[model samples]
Target chain A: TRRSRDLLRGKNVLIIGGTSGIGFAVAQLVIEHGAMACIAGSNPTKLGKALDALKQHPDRDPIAIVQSATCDLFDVPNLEQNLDNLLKLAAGDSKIHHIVFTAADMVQPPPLASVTIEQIQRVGTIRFTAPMLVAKLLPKYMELCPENSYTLTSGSHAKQPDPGWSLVTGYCGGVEGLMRGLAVDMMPLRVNVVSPGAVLTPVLRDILGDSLEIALDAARKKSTTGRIARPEDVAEAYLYIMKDQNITGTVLETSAGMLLR
Target chain B: PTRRSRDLLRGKNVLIIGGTSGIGFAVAQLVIEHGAMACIAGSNPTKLGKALDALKQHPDRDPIAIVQSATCDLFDVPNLEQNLDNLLKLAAGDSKIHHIVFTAADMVQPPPLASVTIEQIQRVGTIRFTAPMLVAKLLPKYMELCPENSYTLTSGSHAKQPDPGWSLVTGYCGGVEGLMRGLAVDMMPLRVNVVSPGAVLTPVLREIALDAARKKSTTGRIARPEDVAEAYLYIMKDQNITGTVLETSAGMLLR
Candidate 1:
C-alpha cells in the first residue's frame, strides 16, 4: 500500500458523454480512484443509467458525491451557453479537477467525391468545435493548474489514413492541433488527447453485430498485440493522462502497436 | 504530349487568395508568366484593383489576360465559403481550376493567454486555418479531381521557436499539417501540401524584427516574396508531393 496517494479526493471530474462505452468506463475508474463524478450526456435516460451504474459500483467511495447532467453539443451555436450551464451544474460548491471528453457520434463520413460542406460542418460539431468550445469555457469554471487536465479522445485514422475516413481523419488531425494550441494558450493547465485504436466497445458491437468478431479478427491481425482492446483497456490511457500533470500538449497514442503493423 | 518545366501550369486556372499583396501577388505574377490563368482575390477592393493593374504592368514582360479578380473578406466568417464559391465560378467560367493557392497572412496579433478571448482566437484562425478548410469543402465541386490538380496552403516560421515576445500566432501548425495529411488521403491523388516559410519581406514590417530575422536565418536574410512562391509552384506542378510540408525557411531552423 502507498503511504499517500494524491488522490482525486473531494474533487469532481466531469465526464462528457459519460453515459456509454469509453466514457462510462472512465467514469467508473475515476470514482473508484476516489473522485466524485458528474456524468453528462445528451440522453437523459442514459445519463440516469450511468449515474445509477456508478452509484452501484462496489469500490466507489461511500461519501463521494455522484452527479449527472444533460448537455447536447448538437446545438453548436449555443454550445457555450450549454457548457456554462453544465459547469455550473457539475460544480455545486465543489472544485472540478479534471475533464474527460469522450463524446463523439458513430460517424461514417461519405466518400471524398460526394462529401459536402454541411457534412464537414456536421462532424465538427462533435469532434473539433465542441471540444474547442469546452476549452474556451474552461478557465472560468475549472482550475488552470498542472493538477487538473482536459483529456480529449481522438482516433487512429489521423495517423493511419483509412481510404473512406479522410474527412474524419482530417478533423481528427484538427483536434490534435486544437489541443496543442490550447496547451500553449492554457499553459500550466495541461491539455492532451488519447488516440486509441480499435476497441470492442458496446457501441462497436451494436454497429458491427454479426460481423463484430469477424471485423475484430481483422483488427487483431493489424495490431502487433494481436488482440482487440476492450473499452476498459483504452480507458486506462485516459486515466493515466489525468493523473500525470507534467505531460501536456502530448498525443498519447494507445494503438497496441497498430501503427507499426 | 510532354510538357516543358516552364509550361507546367500552362492553360491551368490558379486561384490565389489574398493575391493582392505579399507572396500572394508574387505567386500570381509567376503563375501568369508560366501561362496559368490567374484569379486573385483580396479582401480590399483598392488592393484588388491595384493587383489587377500590377498584373498588366510587369516590368520584365507584358502579363496577358490575367483572368479574374474578386473581393473576399475571410474575416467575415459567415460569408467566407459563399464568397469563395462565387470567386471559383467567376474564375473558372465553364472550366475547372487545376490548382489553388492560399497565401493570406495572419494580420491580428494574438493577445497573451490571460486576455485572449474565444472570439479573438476564432477571428485570428478564420483566414489562416478555417477559411482554407471551407475552401477545401467547396473544392470538389469546382476543381478538377485529378492527380495533376493540387491545393497548396501557407503556414510560417512562427511555427518554429519564435522569440517569445514576437511569436504572435497560436500554433496550429500541427493541426494544419495533420489536416493536410487527411486531405491528401481524402482528396487522393490530388496533391495537398503546405509551404512553411521563414520571415518574408512583406511591405508590412517593423525595422527591429526585420533586422533580427535577416541576421537570424542561415542565409543571413529573410525570404523575398518570390522565394517561397516557388515552393507553392513545385507543390502544384509535382504530383509526387502530397501530405507533406515543404519548409523553405532559408535555413532558419539551423540557427
Candidate 2:
C-alpha cells in the first residue's frame, strides 16, 4: 500500500450514496486501501451491486471489509430515523472515522419555465435538508478529532451561475453555508464540501442522456484540462479532505479548470 | 435649502415582505415618508390590519392610496412561490414594483446544532433563504428588472459572530450571502443585496439579550427597528451596491 493507502488502512468509513457515481468510486478507493467500508444508499439493488463489486477486490477478506445499508433521502418524513439506523449499522459497537456524502438526485437542472414548488422541495430535501440532518447526527457517530472527517458534495453551478439554475444556486449555497456551520459546530470533527465540475460518471452519462456526447464535447473545449472529470479524479479530492486534518470549512473544487470558463 | 438629492423612493412602488411588524414595519413607514406607494405583506391578518392603520395615521400622504396590505405565509414552503406571486400581483396593481425590502423573519428558537429536528432544519430556511430566493425567481414577472430596481434581504450579526445555539441561523445567513451573489449574476441588472444588523428592538426583542447586546455595542444601545430600517433604505437607493452586506452592527464587531 502507498502512503495514502496506509493513511486510511483499517479505518472505518461510511460513504452515503456510495452505491453509484463519485460515491461508488470513493467506495472502491476506501476498500482498496484496506479500510472497513460501509456504503449507504436509498436503493438495495444498487447496494448489492456495490457490495459485489467491492467484494471482487483481490485483497478483500472474509471479515466484512465491505458493508451496505439503506437510507433513503426521499424518506424525508423519517429521514432522521433512517440516518440513525444507517449510523448504527455502519458504526455498530465502534465509531466511523470518515463519512463522504455524495447522495444527490438533481442532475437535471430544474428550469424556471416549468419548475413547481413541489419539485423544488424534493430537490431541496435530497440535497439540502437531508444533508443538514446528517450533520446534526454525524458527531455522534464520527471520531471527535481533526483526523476524522466528513466530506459533502456540490457542483460548479454554485459559483458558476447560469439560466435555469436558480434553485440549484440556492441549494448549493445553502449546503455550503451548512458545511461551514457544521465545521464550527462539530468542533475538531472537520467538515468540507467538494464542488466538482462536469464529471462524466455513470450517473451523469445517463442523466445527460440524448445530450451526453454534445455536452461532453462542449464541456471539453471549454475546460482547461480539455476534458471533463472522471469520477476517479474527483474522488481523490474527497480522500484528500478526509486525510488532511487542516482543511475544515473549505469549498474544495476539483472542476478540471472548467470554472475558469 | 434646495433638495440636493433626489428622493429615490418617490413615485416608486415597493413591496415589503414581513412588513406587518418589526423592522419590516419600520421600512414601510420610512418608504412612505419619502412618497413611495407600498404594499406590506405578512402571515398574520391581525398584524396586517394594524400595520395598515399605523400607516393611515401618517399625515402627508393619502393612506388608502399610498399604502396596501396583503398576507403572505413564508413558512408554507409548498405554496411559497405562488403566494409571493399573488402577493406581488396585488402589490403591483397596475404599476411596476421598483424595490423589494424583505425584513421578514420568525422568532427563531436557536437550539444547539445537534439538537435540531427535521422540522427545524426545514422551516428555519423558509423565510430567510427559500422565500427570498423564490422571490428572486419571480423577479422577472413582478418587478421593473433593472439596476435601480433592487431586492434587499436581511441577516443578523450571527453570520459573522460565533455562538453555540445559533448554528442553523448562522448557516442560513452564510447561505444568503452566496445566494444573493448568485441571484445577482443569474438575475443580472436586477440589483441584489443583504443587510446584516446587530441586536434590534423588534417585536422579537426580549430584555435579556437586549441588555447583553447593548453592552456589546460600541454605540452602547441595541438597534432600534427604525434604525435598522435605514440599512434597507441604503441598499434600495444605491444602484451600485449589489452583492454586498451592509452591516449596521454599530461597532459590535470591534468590541
Candidate 3:
C-alpha cells in the first residue's frame, strides 16, 4: 500500500468509463493510492453500480467524492459540456491532475466479411473521436498541475493484426496517432496512452471464452517468463506515466509479449 | 469476476541487454522468478559470469541462456553497431525471442547548458540516443520470427524539467522517448515503449551525489531498484498498453 499511496495521493483523476474493466481498475488503484478524488462518468445504472462498489472502500466515499456526470462519449458536444460542468464541480473544492480516457466501447470480434459500418463507426467514434474531444476539453485540468496528463486506453489489435480484429486494429492505430499528435499539440499538458495485451478482464468474457487463459499459456510458452497479465496488473502503467512529467507524446505498451511480433 | 493467475510468464523466452546490473539485472531476476526461459546479455564477461550465478540460484531459472559479448563501449560507433549486429545474429539463430529489454547505456554526462558544445552533444547523444536506436535496428531480424515480440527501452524524468545542471541527460531522455514512440509506429505489429523513471539511487547516481541539493531534492527517499522494478514487470505483461512512456518516480517532493 505504500506503493499505491506514493504515486497518486492528493491527485485529481477523471475516469471516463469508470464503471468497469481497465477504467474501473484504474479508479480502484488511484483511490487506493489516496487521490483527492476520482471523477467518473458513465450512464446512471453503471454509475450507481460503481458508486455502490466504492461503499466498501476504506476511503469511505469514492462515490461521494467521485463526481458522476452523464457522458455518452458518442455525443461529443454534450459529453464535453457535461464534462465541463463536472470539472467546475470538481474544481469547486480540489484540482484535477490527470485525465484517463478509458471510455471506448469494447470491441467484439466479428469475421471480417460480416462486419458492419455501424459497428466500425461506433467503435471508431468511441476510440478516436471521443478522445480528441477529451483532449480539447483538457484545458480545465491543465490549470491543476505543472504536469497535467491525458492517458488514452488502447488494445492488443494495435500491435497485432489478426483477421477478425480489423476494426480494433484501425481504431487503436488512430488512437495511437491522435494521441501522438495530441501529445505534441497538448504541449505542457502531457498526452500518452497505455496499450495492454491479453488481460483477463470481465468485459471480454462474452467474446473471449477462455481466450485469456489460452493467451496466458501462450505468453508462458513464448515469453522469457510465462506470466500473463491481470487487468489490475496493467493498471500501474497509467499511474507511472501520470507521475513522470518528462514523458509525453508517447505510447506506453503494457502487454508482456502478446503482440511483440 | 475475472480469474486471476499468478506468474503468467512462466515458460517464455526473454533477453535483456545490459542485464548484468541495475534495472536490467533486477528484471532478469523477476522474469526468471515468473518462469520464463530467461537469457541475459552482458558485454562484460566477468559481470556476466556473476549474473549467471545469480540467475542459476533462482529455483525457477531454467536452462536459461547467457550471451556474454562486448555490448559496451557503445560510444565507439564502430563497436556499437558491430556489437548489436552480433547480438541480433545470436538472437536470430535461436528459435524464439518473446521479450527484449534494452537497459544499457554509456556513461551519463551532465554537461551544463552553458557548456553544451557540439562535440559534447554528439558524444552524449551517441551513447544515450544513437546507440540504443542502432541496437534496436539490428534486433529486428530475430524479432520477425517470434509470435509476439516486443522491445522496451528506459528513459528518465529529468527531461520534463531541464534544470541548469542536467541539460545533456534531459536531451537524451527526450531522445529515448521519441525513439520509443517512433519505434512503436515503425515496428508496428511489434510493440516498443520506454520506462522513464525519476530519481533512483542506482550505482550510477550513488557515487556522484555531487552536492546536497541533488540529494535533498529527491525528498530524502530516493527510489530503490526493487521499487522501480515492478513497473518493468507490469510493462512486460501488459498487452493493452504500448507506444507510451511509463514513469517510475516515487512522488518525491522534488519541488
Query: Candidate 2 — which residues are off by over 4 angstroms?
Result: A1-6, A58-64, A103-105, A217-226, A258-261, B1-8, B45-65, B76-83, B104-107, B133-140, B160-162, B174-182, B185-189, B199-203, B206-228, B240-255
User: Model 2 chain A: which ten-residue window has the lowest total lDDT?
Assistant: A104-113
* Candidate 3 residue runs with Cα over 4 Å from true position: A1-7, A39-43, A59-64, A89-94, A103-105, A109-119, A144-146, A206-224, B1-255
lDDT of 3 by residue, B1-255 (tens): 011212456555677777777777777777776666566677678888887777667654434434333345556665666766676666545565677787846336554433334345456556665556566555665665232566888866555544434434543565566556655655666777778766666664553553333564555556677676777777777766677878766543356
Q: iRMSD per model?
A: 4.0, 2.2, 13.7
Candidate that beats the other on lDDT, 1 or 3, i.e. the better one: 1
Candidate 3 DockQ category?
Answer: incorrect
DockQ of each candidate, alpha-carbon based: 0.36, 0.43, 0.02
Q: Global lDDT of each model?
A: 0.75, 0.78, 0.62
Cα lDDT for residue B32, candidate 1: 75
Better model by TM-score, 1 or 2? 1
In candidate 1, the residue pairs with backbone N, CA or C atoms under 3 Å apart (3 or more residues apart, or in different chains) clash, namely: none
- In every candidate, what fraction of the native interface contacts is reproduced? 0.37, 0.41, 0.00
Q: Write the per-residue lDDT of candidate 2 for residues B1-255, one digit (tens) a residue.
A: 013122566778889998888888888887887777888988889878988998767665534338889988888876778888898888778878888888746446577877887677768777677788677767678787699889888777767664656667766776677677677776778898888887777765546777788888899887788898988877777788887778888788887
Candidate 1 stretches with Cα past 4 Å from truth are A1-4, A61-64, A110-119, A164-166, B1-4, B60-67, B75-82, B93-95, B110-134, B157-175, B211-221, B249-255
The model with the greatest DockQ is 2
